[PDB]
Amino acid sequence: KTEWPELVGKSVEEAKKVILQDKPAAQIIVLPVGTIVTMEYRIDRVRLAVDRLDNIAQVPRVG
């Protein structure tokens, strides 16, 4: 499991809980949607992109 499209529109809290069930060693970083980020690929990382309400705004994926 490397992408979580069912998490879009959920709270950042539920998204972290679900991703850590699927990938308990995940390194989760939360950032505002519409920011620019580094393009290295980290198999252990899952970035979360949140809207101004702290809901998931883009499909989380590993990288």
């Binding site: 950032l31 519409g34 980020v37 580094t38 393009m39 690929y41």
Partner: protein, 281 residues
């Protein structure tokens, strides 16, 4: 003893080095998370930070900008790694904080700094899924001003027949670079789409890390600086070539790999790019 990372060899940079061309007097901005200027295998010529809470561009609290910089320009000596353009004048243009993120205006401010400071090449190992008009204007302005602008294609992998190249790589004026490994196979994470321009090594790429370390990273972030460094080599051999001509030289001399949707024009070959007459090998 120094080691030459495989990706530097794979793009044929040693052929330029043996001709005597190493990126001397070419100004390359690494628009990124900073560059650790204390690293003994890097020489940072200047820079600026556009990160409000991290005002020193010579302190890299993430590690990413340092790694990218070493691929562009790690020094030619008896230590560490060798960069693609080891004599380039390297500028730390810090637009990302410790967490590897930046606001669009910070990136734009860095691009503006680079234009105002007469940079010859910009490398942006960075990106986002959406554009903005102001971002597009900044990169187009840089290109109109003569700067070779290179960026990571993105690490989105495939999505059916959709393009997954992010911005600013997705803009026509920016050279979007995807990642291959040492066998010239596209990395599975490498973004795809008609905006993919060229490929370079982006798997298990050894380079400089903060606090006098080295390590192997993966990403289109690692591929992009092979191309920015190649642009600096070509400009050191042909100092009057415009950005238009450097970009076409790199595009016109790739080693073609697969379908262009997945590979763009193929793997860069800086030896062939820096000849007067260009063809694919």
């Amino acid at each position: 003893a120094q080691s030459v990372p495989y990706g530097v060899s794979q793009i044929k940079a040693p052929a330029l080095h043996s001709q005597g061309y190493t990126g001397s007097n070419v100004k390359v901005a690494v628009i990124d998370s900073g560059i650790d200027s204390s690293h003994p295998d890097l020489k940072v010529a200047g820079g600026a930070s556009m990160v409000p809470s991290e005002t020193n561009p010579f302190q890299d609290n993430n590690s990413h900008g340092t790694h990218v910089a070493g691929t562009v320009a790690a020094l030619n000596n008896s230590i560490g790694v060798l960069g693609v353009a080891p004599s380039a004048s390297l500028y730390a243009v810090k637009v990302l904080g410790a967490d590897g993120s930046g606001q669009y205006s910070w990136i734009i401010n860095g691009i503006e700094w680079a234009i105002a400071n007469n940079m010859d090449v910009i490398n942006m190992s960075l990106g986002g899924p959406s554009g903005s008009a102001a971002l597009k204007a900044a990169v187009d302005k840089a290109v109109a001003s003569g700067v070779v602008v290179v960026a990571a294609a993105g690490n989105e992998g495939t999505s059916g027949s959709s393009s997954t190249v992010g911005y600013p790589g997705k803009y026509p004026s920016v050279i979007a670079v995807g990642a291959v490994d040492s066998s010239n196979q596209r990395a599975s994470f490498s973004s795809v789409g008609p905006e993919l321009d060229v490929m370079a090594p982006g798997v298990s790429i050894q380079s400089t890390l903060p606090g006098n370390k080295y390590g192997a990273y993966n990403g289109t972030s690692m591929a992009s600086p092979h191309v920015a460094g190649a642009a600096a080599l070509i400009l050191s051999k042909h100092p009057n070539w415009t950005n238009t001509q450097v970009r076409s030289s790199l595009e016109n001399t790739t080693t073609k790999l697969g379908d262009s949707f997945y590979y763009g024009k193929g793997l860069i070959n800086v030896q062939a790019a820096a000849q007067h007459h260009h063809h694919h090998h």
